[model samples]
Target: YRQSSATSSFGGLGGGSVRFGPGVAFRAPSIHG
Candidate 1:
């Protein structure tokens, strides 16, 4: 994927990196994948 302003912000957080894209979804893997 091409670089995006938001994408560039990945790992910019003190905690961890973030990902963004179309058809992308995040679930609570904490509970179970």
Candidate 2:
């Protein structure tokens, strides 16, 4: 499990979200509730 600085934001504008495992590079989720 790899934690990333890529925290999920609308457009990755703010601080990044965390991701686990080997996957695509972190891109913020398009829709936030």
Candidate 3:
């Protein structure tokens, strides 16, 4: 998993997803509720 952001309002957004082995993967924003 990973997260990235820029220099703005929605720029505060970020997200990522990855595959683990053969049956695991997830990605969520750090600011998710």
Q: Please rank every candidate by lDDT, starting with the best.
A: 1, 2, 3
> Which pairs clash (backbone N, Cα, C closer than 3 Å) in model 3?
none
Per-candidate TM vs. native?
0.21, 0.19, 0.18
Ranked candidates (TM-score, high to low) = 1, 2, 3
* Count: clashes, candidate 1: 1
Candidate 2 lDDT by residue in tens digits, 1-33: 222443442333333444354655654555856
Q: Give stretches of model 3 more than 4 Å off.
A: 1-19, 28-33
lDDT of each: 0.47, 0.43, 0.37
Alpha carbon lDDT at 17, candidate 3: 28
lDDT of 3 by residue, 1-33 (tens): 463222232333345322234434234446855
| CA displacement after TM-score superposition, residue 29 of candidate 1 (Å) | 11
Colliding residue pairs in candidate 1 = 11-17
Residue 33 of model 2: what lDDT?
Answer: 62
